[PDB]
Design a protein around this ligand. Structure first.
Ligand SMILES: O=C(O)CNC(=O)C(=O)O
Ligand SMILES: O=C(O)CNC(=O)C(=O)O
Ligand SMILES: [Mn+2]
Length: 220
């Protein structure tokens, strides 16, 4: 058993999947050893108190209705004790680089830092939402899941995606060493169903050059 080269995974699987469905799941992305190291680094972030409630990020005010029960932190990838998260981010970047110019009409020219997120069980989730509804430049959502032996039947935590205007929907279990791509805009409203166990994931959003520039123009 051998890893597929990034170029081959990108052009033979990710590009066609994305252009046909707007969603692409890649399992066994990095392997057990690396995935476990990433899990250790995320758990260290959690135990040392680096997470902030995601509700604080998404709410309009402290009176707003509940949106999300996760806790998050932003990782650049070069921080001490986050080197393996940095390797994950470089691996994502390599796939996108081999895709660029073939994912719809997008020209991807940047990305966010990594959003490390924890749903601490207790029935927490994330109401249905669109990641980028107002044209802030993000065109692709990329999520890496880190949860060993996750049993959705008992622990829940399914990501459910409802592709706009299609007669289908997708259920993504937050499985260990799974990589997920999907269009960030209104085409993919999605929700995280209540999680009854600790659920970790790492997300990066990629930027489309033209839309991000236009967003900067409205910005100014
Ligand atoms: O963690 C997941 O499966 C999905 N998370 C989100 O939709 C988000 O944080 O915006
Ligand atoms: O089928 C889809 O589009 C997404 N879900 C999966 O890849 C799975 O549950 O294995
Ligand atoms: Mn989302």
């Amino acid at each position: 058993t051998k890893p597929l080269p990034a170029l081959k995974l990108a052009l033979e699987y990710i590009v066609p999947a994305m252009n046909k469905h707007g969603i692409c799941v890649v399992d066994d992305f990095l392997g057990k050893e690396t995935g476990q190291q990433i899990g250790d680094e995320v758990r260290a972030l959690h135990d040392t108190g680096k997470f902030t409630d995601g509700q604080l990020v998404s709410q309009k005010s402290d009176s707003s209705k509940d949106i999300r029960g996760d806790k998050i932190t932003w990782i650049e990838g070069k921080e001490p004790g986050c080197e393996t998260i940095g390797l994950l981010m470089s691996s994502m970047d390599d796939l996108i680089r081999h895709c660029n110019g073939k994912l719809g009409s997008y020209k991807i020219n940047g990305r966010t830092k990594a959003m490390v997120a924890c749903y601490p069980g207790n029935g927490t989730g994330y109401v249905r939402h669109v990641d980028n509804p107002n044209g802030d430049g993000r065109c692709v959502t990329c999520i890496y899941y880190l949860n060993k032996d996750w049993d959705a039947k008992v622990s829940g935590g399914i990501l459910r995606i409802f592709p706009e205007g299609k007669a289908q929907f997708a259920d993504i279990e937050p499985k260990f060493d799974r990589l997920l791509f999907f269009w960030s805009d209104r085409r993919n409203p999605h929700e995280v169903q209540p999680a009854y166990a600790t659920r970790y994931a790492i997300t990066v959003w990629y930027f489309d050059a033209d839309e991000r520039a236009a967003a900067k123009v409205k910005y100014l």
